[PDB]
Amino acid sequence: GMTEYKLVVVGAGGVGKSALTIQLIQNHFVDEYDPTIEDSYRKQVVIDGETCLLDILDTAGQEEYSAMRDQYMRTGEGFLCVFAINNTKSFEDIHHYREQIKRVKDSEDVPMVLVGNKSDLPSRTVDTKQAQDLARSYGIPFIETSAKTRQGVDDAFYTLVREIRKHK
Numbered sequence: 168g169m170t171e172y173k174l175v176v177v178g179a180g181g182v183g184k185s186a187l188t189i190q191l192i193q194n195h196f197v198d199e200y201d202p203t204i205e206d207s208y209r210k211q212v213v214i215d216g217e218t219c220l221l222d223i224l225d226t227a228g229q230e231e232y233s234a235m236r237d238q239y240m241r242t243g244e245g246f247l248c249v250f251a252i253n254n255t256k257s258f259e260d261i262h263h264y265r266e267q268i269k270r271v272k273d274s275e276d277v278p279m280v281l282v283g284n285k286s287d288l289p290s291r292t293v294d295t296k297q298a299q300d301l302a303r304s305y306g307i308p309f310i311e312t313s314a315k316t317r318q319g320v321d322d323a324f325y326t327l328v329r330e331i332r333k334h335k
């Protein structure tokens with residue numbers, strides 16, 4: 168049967184979670200997508216010759232630490248933790264997202280990729296070295312993306328699928 172992989176995209180508002188997701192789903196850059204919309208989208212993709220079904224949850228909205236939200240995030244098998252390379256605050260929030268994932272999955276080994284988005288922009292405030300070193304601290308991959316140009320998009324999502332396969 169075709170394996171389905173439940174992937175969750177997290178990170179500060181405005182980093183490009185929706186743009187990245189819609190790039191994967193539509194193969195089109197969408198510069199405007201209602202920042203409140205949290206939803207899930209499926210795509211069949213060929214990853215290393217295997218057609219698998221991706222189910223991507225593009226998260227949005229305020230923090231909610233209810234039992235219900237924790238149960239829903241626990242459905243995720245892997246997580247993209249996204250920051251924007253021109254927004255320091257978004258990078259400094261990454262540890263919070265990683266800590267919430269570790270808590271809800273009750274594991275120090277959750278499949279995860281660190282994503283530095285907006286790589287097409289000239290306004291960098293987060294050095295690539297600093298981001299690579301954060302991923303090294305966590306023992307996870309780091310991928311540089313642009314939802315605008317499609318740089319890194321398959322790399323981010325497909326690496327996460329390979330991380331889940333190694334974990335299973």
Ligand SMILES: C[C@H]1CNCCN1c1nccc(-c2noc([C@@]3(C)CCCc4sc(N)c(C#N)c43)n2)n1
Nearest residue numbers: 177229230231232236237240260263264267268271
């Ligand atoms: C960085 C902080 C603190 N300063 C203000 C901004 N902020 C913030 N804003 C908005 C959202 C969040 C935030 N944290 O974790 C999560 C997620 C979706 C990540 C995946 C695992 C779980 S499990 C659970 N119940 C979740 C929630 N709600 C989450 N989302 N964090």
Ligand SMILES: Nc1nc2c(ncn2[C@@H]2O[C@H](COP(=O)(O)OP(=O)(O)O)[C@@H](O)[C@H]2O)c(=O)[nH]1
Nearest residue numbers: 180181182183184185186198199285313314315
């Ligand atoms: N230049 C550029 N802008 C982007 C990129 N990804 C998203 N954006 C812009 O960043 C803003 C937030 O994107 P959005 O996908 O709504 O972020 P979300 O709140 O994390 O879902 C919008 O103004 C998008 O046009 C990217 O890779 N490059």
Ligand SMILES: [Mg+2]
Nearest residue numbers: 184185202227
């Ligand atoms: Mg969004």
